[PDB]
Design a protein around this ligand. Sequence first.
Ligand code: NAI
Ligand code: CL
Ligand code: CL
Ligand code: CL
Ligand code: CL
Ligand code: CL
Ligand code: CL
Ligand code: CL
Ligand code: CL
Ligand code: CL
Ligand code: CL
Ligand code: CL
Ligand code: CL
Ligand code: YB
Ligand code: YB
Ligand code: YB
Ligand code: YB
Ligand code: YB
Ligand code: YB
Ligand code: YB
Ligand code: YB
Lengths: 493, 493, 493, 493
Amino acid sequence: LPVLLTDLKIQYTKIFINNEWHDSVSGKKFPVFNPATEEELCQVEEGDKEDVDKAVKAARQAFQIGSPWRTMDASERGRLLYKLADLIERDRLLLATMESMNGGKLYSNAYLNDLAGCIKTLRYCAGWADKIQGRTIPIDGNFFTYTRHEPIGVCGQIIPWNFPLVMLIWKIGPALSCGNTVVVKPAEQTPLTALHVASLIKEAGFPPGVVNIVPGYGPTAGAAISSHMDIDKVAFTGSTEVGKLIKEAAGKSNLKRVTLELGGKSPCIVLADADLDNAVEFAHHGVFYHQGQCCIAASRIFVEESIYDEFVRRSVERAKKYILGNPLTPGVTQGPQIDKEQYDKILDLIESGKKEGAKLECGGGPWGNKGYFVQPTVFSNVTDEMRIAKEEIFGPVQQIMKFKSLDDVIKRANNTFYGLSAGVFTKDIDKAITISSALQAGTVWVNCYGVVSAQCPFGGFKMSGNGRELGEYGFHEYTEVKTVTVKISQKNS
Amino acid sequence: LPVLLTDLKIQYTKIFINNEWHDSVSGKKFPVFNPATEEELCQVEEGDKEDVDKAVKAARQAFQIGSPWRTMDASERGRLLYKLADLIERDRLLLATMESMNGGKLYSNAYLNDLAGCIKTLRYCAGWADKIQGRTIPIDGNFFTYTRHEPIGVCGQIIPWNFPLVMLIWKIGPALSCGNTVVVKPAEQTPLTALHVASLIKEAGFPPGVVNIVPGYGPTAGAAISSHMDIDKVAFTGSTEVGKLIKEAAGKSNLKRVTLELGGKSPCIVLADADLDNAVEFAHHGVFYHQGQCCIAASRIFVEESIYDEFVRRSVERAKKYILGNPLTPGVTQGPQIDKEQYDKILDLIESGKKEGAKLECGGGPWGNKGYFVQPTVFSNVTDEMRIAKEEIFGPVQQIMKFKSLDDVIKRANNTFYGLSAGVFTKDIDKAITISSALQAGTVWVNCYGVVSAQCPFGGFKMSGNGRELGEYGFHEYTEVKTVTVKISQKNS
Amino acid sequence: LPVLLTDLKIQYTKIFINNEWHDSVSGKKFPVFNPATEEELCQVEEGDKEDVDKAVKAARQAFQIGSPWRTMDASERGRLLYKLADLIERDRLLLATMESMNGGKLYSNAYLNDLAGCIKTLRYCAGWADKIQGRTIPIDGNFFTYTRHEPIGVCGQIIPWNFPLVMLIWKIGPALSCGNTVVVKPAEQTPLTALHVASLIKEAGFPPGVVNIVPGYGPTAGAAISSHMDIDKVAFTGSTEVGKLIKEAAGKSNLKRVTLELGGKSPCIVLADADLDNAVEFAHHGVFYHQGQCCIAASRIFVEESIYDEFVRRSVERAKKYILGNPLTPGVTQGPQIDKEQYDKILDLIESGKKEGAKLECGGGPWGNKGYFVQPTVFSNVTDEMRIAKEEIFGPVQQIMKFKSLDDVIKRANNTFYGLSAGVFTKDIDKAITISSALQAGTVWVNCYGVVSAQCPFGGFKMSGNGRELGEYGFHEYTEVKTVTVKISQKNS
Amino acid sequence: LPVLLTDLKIQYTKIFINNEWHDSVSGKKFPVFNPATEEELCQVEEGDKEDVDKAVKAARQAFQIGSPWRTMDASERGRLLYKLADLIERDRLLLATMESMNGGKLYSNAYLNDLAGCIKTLRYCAGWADKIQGRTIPIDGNFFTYTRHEPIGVCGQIIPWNFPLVMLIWKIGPALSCGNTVVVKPAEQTPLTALHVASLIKEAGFPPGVVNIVPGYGPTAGAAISSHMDIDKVAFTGSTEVGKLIKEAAGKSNLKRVTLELGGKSPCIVLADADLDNAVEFAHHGVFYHQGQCCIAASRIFVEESIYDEFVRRSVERAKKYILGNPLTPGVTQGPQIDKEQYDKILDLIESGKKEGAKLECGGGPWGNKGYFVQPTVFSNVTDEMRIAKEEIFGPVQQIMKFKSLDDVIKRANNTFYGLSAGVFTKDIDKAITISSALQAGTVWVNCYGVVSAQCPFGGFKMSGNGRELGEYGFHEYTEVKTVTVKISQKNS
Ligand SMILES: NC(=O)C1=CN([C@@H]2O[C@H](COP(=O)(O)OP(=O)(O)OC[C@H]3O[C@@H](n4cnc5c(N)ncnc54)[C@H](O)[C@@H]3O)[C@@H](O)[C@H]2O)C=CC1
Ligand SMILES: [Cl-]
Ligand SMILES: [Cl-]
Ligand SMILES: [Cl-]
Ligand SMILES: [Cl-]
Ligand SMILES: [Cl-]
Ligand SMILES: [Cl-]
Ligand SMILES: [Cl-]
Ligand SMILES: [Cl-]
Ligand SMILES: [Cl-]
Ligand SMILES: [Cl-]
Ligand SMILES: [Cl-]
Ligand SMILES: [Cl-]
Ligand SMILES: [Yb+3]
Ligand SMILES: [Yb+3]
Ligand SMILES: [Yb+3]
Ligand SMILES: [Yb+3]
Ligand SMILES: [Yb+3]
Ligand SMILES: [Yb+3]
Ligand SMILES: [Yb+3]
Ligand SMILES: [Yb+3]
């Protein structure tokens, strides 16, 4: 675990359009905070509708037929992405430090997980660029028919604050590999890593207007994306509420394509035959990773009665071992929550747990004199009508529940409007296969949890989202299929 | 061209849920008319929110894990579809007559085109059922990862009145092949063929609740589909306005998946080197097929100056050869428009053409003492700001325009919020390829027009829709991808 | 289990070329026998080099550019195949009776398994015909590149006597769906079902010369196929020895494409945690199905020491329950071996088992006064250097072996030049996955055996064959890929 | 065009097995010559059967289950390949100089074409490694079925002398991306670039035994590959004669998988409407590139009568513009032929042209006092029974022929046992499509020639080879498909 051996200096704080830095049209700036100290870190230009319009015009122009982005070899798009990945690898110390400081993310995770996942995903995406293929099709009649899998066009991409760099790369990686141009709006909480990457996009050699980054607020810069008449597609990760607003604004404006990833209330089912220690460890890391601020948080754990008390006890001993503090100090193993809204929401939900009658096993309150810290918290004997069983908490708050009937527990796992992920822990082949098939979730892990790789499509069932990101599948949402059918005198198979 | 040698008797007029006929919960019925006579043909049960709720519960139940539709072999879903196609082939005379009478569709087309396309598309779809495959994926780490391409669930499908039977099959064919259950709402104008097919679904042996058909109105039965909390996906073909309402209602309710096909203002570009007679014929059939009531109507024809006057003259001579009347009488080559709304809209747009200064070459008014007939109408010297150049007419109304610059005419072809289809007529390889690539349209025909086959994906760019129907691609919109990732002790390539 | 209620009358006994019946050029005929009685059933025209040349010229002509087979819609090839499947379904009683009588195959299996598999496989293949697609490829430079997946051309197909009808359909199904023409040489032992199917090919409406069937001998009619200068591809199922001759003759002549399926010595590994009864049943049916005359015969069964004696005992009790006799009489559960060569080979191998020191548990000799019957035979304490552990017996002869080390038993399972299939019986997820990955075999069954479906590719590792048949994969071996690359003025993604 | 500014020093001259340098078991060495001077350049260790056995054992061991090559992430195989490409890019000057000196290849081509194609192809292949996916398959019955696309195993790869570096990378790139281990035998004429790349394989970090390189002779080291009992697959580019020997030896030994690329006699058809200058240029470069020593050499040019004399005249003026000499000196535009065998064969064929009555337009003899130089030579009025129209010359020798009937000229183009490539030059869409479909060739170029990219599959019809290399398709020949079918209690779609 190497570290930056010189204090981090923030440099890129402006709006990035056509590979140059622009001040906000209004001249307004907004503050950016560190969540562990509540101290301001810098001011960033505040983008709004007028700046979005500028980014969109640049993106549109970069996408015109005959332009350098449209006419370069697909293999050269791939090369640009590969080069960006090498540049990110060059600035890894810096970016991981910036991510940790701005995002409240543990430095060891920022460096070993986030940054590594950024680099690997870009390289994965680089590899697809010249391997996106259409078809030739044996249509009835004397015709030659082929399809092109073209890029869609200008894609607006609204990113959240929990994984600012991973999510930036998950969005722009596929979009760019397929040949699209993008207008990115980072989360207001966490604009900084995105703007450093924009400096690397320029340095890699991407043509101007291919990537534009407009820091700003949601109901301002985000709503101007979602309602824009010349944006062909919008991709969004974040809250359900906003997902609904995005889909509505899309329908009202120009029927732009929409893909969403919206969090979850993901269940694990631990059968009596499970390797218990393995199940406790993965369920634990499933819910507590990054202060609970993961979409796939393992936030309902159903354990068969006969091993339930052992499961609860082992889980509590594990939750009691954290050291809270500044995510930059080695040995610190739990950072702060991102901000006051999230902090309030977590405390309120913990309170509802106590009031509705859940059994509190540890934690249950705030921590420290500054920073948005919450004690890791475990509730046992949770039941299905409680707020902590139904609502995404997005904090370090584990719910543990009992079951004795397998048909019953699968219905309880499925009885939610969410559907992002689930975990099954069993040694039996048949149950692993039949349970995983019956679960209404986009990713199901068997005997593990939270395993996410560039090679696999990732996305929700139900209100956890639509579409898929990554894997071969993800690239489909970033193309528009055109059929060309040509009259010929006579066809031959 | 064989005919039904016994008068058509209407038999199925009720709501179809769980393979039985139901009266409307309200007890209300609505009338159904013949467009060529304006006479009522029968009354049909009027479905509303309460009946949609019943159809959805049946569909949901038919989709439960462990049910006959979920556990039967994929090859047996395929077999059911094949059998349905054979039954439709058995009742071809009847269905074509019913289609013609209710839909105002020329009998020869109903029999030779629609019914044939219904049968072929079903058989195409039957073939995919056991050929829908997921993947195994060489994920980083010691895991086994696979995907399932599962059915999505309960699909609501809202069909229009222009191609009632083709569009029913385009919707249910893929949906069923992939393993979904469906709630279909036929157009209020044209419920009858759908309900006859429901009798054939029962006779083929589909399990109850797999297909449910709820005739009724749009803002009642359609809005209850689009806003329903237990419908996983909605597919819709029809007007832009309603498309926007559907997408909005989806976002407000349960973030159901949405696919739309929304018509167009599709352009042809006729270059000076084109086979002129071939271009005139295909552009003509492109705009006048089924009384102009096609989504892909070739409604802006740009012709290079040097052949423009010849193109116009030949086009007018062709338009002057129709015989209007009842679509059942042989020799009749133009039927009525579907109803009064559409009829009024077409007359109004024709009037705007005259007023805005287009040159009228033939037609321009109504015809007959009954039926919603419009004379085939040709406008030359149309220019791009006129209503007849911008708005989908959906009537027999051809627009012909001039160009001399190729870069310019491609911008004019693209300068529309629509993007369903386009045609290019040239003998030159390079232009065919480069023009077809630059056109912002879902299907581009070269030296032909209106060629649509089950083997090709079909759908819009821009506001002409999202998603694709048919071909291999179409089946993708009817699956939900699940990733299953299993921990293993050691992987080996 | 319905039966033919009228004595079977043999009708088609000639060479089938250009959809007509031809006598041998030489005028020679050969006899065909029933294996259960050793009585002659009829004489069949004997095809040789001169008749193969005639069939090849017909096939070549049917494949010319501009011919009806090359220019018909792919969907219509599919329709012909579907129709053939319906005709086979019509003549099911007859064909199953013919298969049983000529092939020594139990009537219940012939009817319920073979004929059903013939019908299902044809229908599967019918479905692929218009779903074979090439690609469009984003090549470097200003080019348009696409591929066609064309048929290869004239395919020679040499079929064995164990599954005459299944294997005929496995060969012609894919070949025809892809658009090839074929010259089929059925086994000399079993020409009759093939020639009845040829009558159905004519009746279905296949153009002449698309399918040609040349009954005859191996070193005559088969060698003329394998060495022919105008046959593009040869597919073969049968002995290793002949496989080597085919591959050699291909290399010496015209470098025709070659695919082989060559039998095996397929192992099962039964772990201590296995459901024992399930493992005994499937291993039993694995080796004894169709008198042991299956390529995938489970001919080495390794069982963990701690359950080995129980496994052996249960296996012997199951083997002792057969009734030998004429495969047409209900209640008969073991038929004869196909002929004297096979009969001698099985007796000789049984003798070597006794002499080399294997423990004989039941059977071990011939049965009856006529027919090529062998008693079902079980050997325990078999060890790896014995002939019965190394050589494919192709008779009802089960070998059961002991193991205690899992690494060791996987090496023993793999230590063979064969590699067709294998079985693993365990309840543990990890072992199922890691064992199946380590086994050098084309199909691995987990907790079952002998499960073969049209949807799965099927074929050998190592000397068990090359290429794959069926599934999506199988269709690849029946196409030839052509790349077409077109210069254009400017490409755009 | 940069150059090596220091004399080339040859360093790697030994056999490469398990990432170390080995002397021949026999202690024998063979000489390596420069073709432009006929001077010896160095001695190289001579590998034979005994050294092949050593390389095969190393490859086999590197492929064992549990080894580092089998257990590393697919993405890390990809990373190794990417790193190798960067190392080759680092040593580009050196390798291009070495290629030119040893291979008689023009330095500008070696640097700008060969080395660039090596680098691009490796990077293309790097991208596929973690994108090779199997399937999940909806088999009939209650089973879970998936396929693995595993590597095949030990692949022997025999490379020719015309494109030593390109062909090395075309072989090892896909093989390695898919996870195979390889034993490479470079051409005796040109072992040197291969052994330098082996030093880069070691430096990149490939595990030992993954790549082994055994320089030596064909009937010794090559025949030991083709007949080896533990080599799973052999890939070969070279002469037809040897292709037949390889396929035969494969069949006699262990039925190893075989893929061949075997040269051609590729035709161009120039229609009267063609851009004539474009056709002359591309046909010219088609036949004369690399001294005619290309498999895809455009060695029969059929030109429509009405433009034939103009075509011939322009072609001759172009052929007259070369400067022969040492391929290292700038301004030199034609190098020597590779060696005496090839030199003799070319002179002999030129002589047969003169004797059989072809019209000689220029060249026709040797050149210089040292080096294997041949004058660029043009023959017009060639007719189809002449040796120069039938036999692959593999020298700078252009044949130009007349036609007036299009059906006739397509038969003449197809009337050959070769089938590698062809060219069509026309401005007409229909002819481009219908001619390209009727030509029996693996790649057909339209309005260009010799366009080969990593993204496209490449290979022969007929005796020009079997299988395909590169593109998505190429990777298929380097996997072995395994089906795993698992019994389950109940399946659900
Ligand atoms: N894409 C196409 O092929 C079609 C395009 N159109 C276009 O739209 C214009 C208007 O025609 P209309 O018949 O009014 O089409 P419409 O779009 O309103 O009717 C089509 C279908 O949508 C249903 N519908 C209507 N209102 C709805 C609502 N609020 N929620 C859910 N479903 C609803 C109708 O009941 C019918 O089943 C036409 O002149 C034509 O330009 C119309 C029909 C088909
Ligand atoms: Cl908000
Ligand atoms: Cl907010
Ligand atoms: Cl808010
Ligand atoms: Cl409406
Ligand atoms: Cl309305
Ligand atoms: Cl309305
Ligand atoms: Cl033999
Ligand atoms: Cl024999
Ligand atoms: Cl023999
Ligand atoms: Cl040789
Ligand atoms: Cl030689
Ligand atoms: Cl030689
Ligand atoms: Yb918010
Ligand atoms: Yb505070
Ligand atoms: Yb409407
Ligand atoms: Yb009226
Ligand atoms: Yb034999
Ligand atoms: Yb006997
Ligand atoms: Yb040679
Ligand atoms: Yb000399």
